[PDB]
Amino acid sequence: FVADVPPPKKGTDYDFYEAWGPVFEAEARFSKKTPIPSLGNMDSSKKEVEQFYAFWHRFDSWRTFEFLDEDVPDDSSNRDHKRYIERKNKAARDKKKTADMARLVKLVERAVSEDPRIKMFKEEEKKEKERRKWE
């Protein structure tokens, strides 16, 4: 199957790439979209880093949450039974998918907040704006 890698433990010391690279690599195996950009390296360009986080901000997963599906009968004498349990199952899966999406949103937010390149990119932009003097 596809293995899961938890995020690095908040509040410990670690290299940003050593810690988060394996997390995104594992999460990305569930992508319905390719190509799949890499977290990258210390020298990735601002545009590459923007593209990486854009992919995640639009992530579309095929991860299934079908473990708690009720069995759907094909032979019920109640004609509505089959579609009813399909819809009840799907509602449960959808709730879990919604949670999974929310989980990923928070994971990505965390990574953005720790990305050392973004800190430098924001410093560079700040100096650009100051030079431009549009206020």
UniProtKB/Swiss-Prot annotation:
The lineage of its organism: Eukaryota, Fungi, Dikarya, Ascomycota, Saccharomycotina. The chain holds residues 169 to 303 of 433 of the full protein. Transmembrane segments: none annotated. It is found in: Cytoplasm. Present with 86400 molecules/cell in log phase SD medium. This is Zuotin. RAC is a heterodimer of the Hsp70/DnaK-type chaperone SSZ1 and the Hsp40/DnaJ-type chaperone ZUO1. RAC associates with ribosomes via ZUO1. Component of the ribosome-associated complex (RAC), a heterodimeric chaperone complex involved in regulation of accurate translation termination and in folding or maintaining nascent polypeptides in a folding-competent state. RAC stimulates the ATPase activity of the ribosome-associated pool of Hsp70-type chaperones SSB1/SSB2 that bind to the nascent polypeptide chain. ZUO1 can act as a J-protein for SSB1/SSB2 only when associated with SSZ1.
